[PDB]
């Protein structure tokens, strides 16, 4: 009971009748937030257009490569489109071992570790 009463007190401060009220800004305060909200959503637009511009440029570099490759005769006696048809195959792309977990598991960090990189890694 004493431990359960402690839980119920945690749900009491979260009651709709006890949580803090909606903010009340004056004008100069309301306009300062309107200016900060307008610059944040603009910063997000710039980061979006940049983010999406690079993706479109990577995509076009792939297209220009896979368009040339589609019209290449070779190597040797292989006919036109061979390498192109071999590059468009998706064998193993949608399986369990598609992306190595040593690469995906390494998410970014604010500061590096004691050993940032392991040059002594051996096969």
């Amino acid at each position: 009971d004493p431990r359960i009463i402690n839980i119920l007190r945690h749900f009491a401060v979260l009651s709709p009748k006890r949580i803090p009220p909606p903010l009340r800004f004056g004008r100069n305060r309301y306009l300062r937030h309107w200016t900060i909200h307008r610059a944040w959503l603009l910063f997000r637009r710039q980061q979006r257009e940049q983010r999406e511009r690079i993706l479109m440029q990577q995509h076009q570099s792939m297209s220009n490569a896979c368009e040339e490759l589609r019209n290449t005769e070779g190597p040797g006696t292989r006919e036109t489109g061979y390498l192109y048809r071999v590059a468009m195959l998706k064998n193993g792309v949608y399986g369990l071992k598609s992306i190595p977990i040593e690469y995906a598991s390494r998410a970014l960090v604010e500061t590096p570790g004691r050993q940032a990189w392991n040059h002594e890694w051996k096969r």
């Binding site: 945690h10 401060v13 979260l14 009651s15 709709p16 949580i19 909606p22 977990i101 040593e102 598991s105 970014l108 960090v109 604010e110 500061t111 590096p112 570790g113 004691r114 050993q115 890694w121």
Partner: protein, 58 residues
């Protein structure tokens, strides 16, 4: 007259998380601990590090 509900969110802190590799990053959580040291995580697990021999005991 559809009610306009309000959000009921508990107090959230900013926490520093130190993985087993010594790397650090900041998160947002409800626990008041300022620094969370992690001794066992994905950086020290053989299922996430299949090519790490230090963690391989055979």
């Amino acid at each position: 007259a559809t009610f306009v509900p309000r959000h009921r969110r508990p107090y959230q802190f900013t926490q520093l998380v130190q993985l087993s590799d010594g790397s650090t990053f900041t998160v947002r959580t409800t626990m008041p601990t300022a620094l969370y040291k992690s001794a066992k995580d994905s950086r020290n697990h053989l299922l996430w590090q299949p090519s790490d021999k230090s963690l391989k005991n055979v």
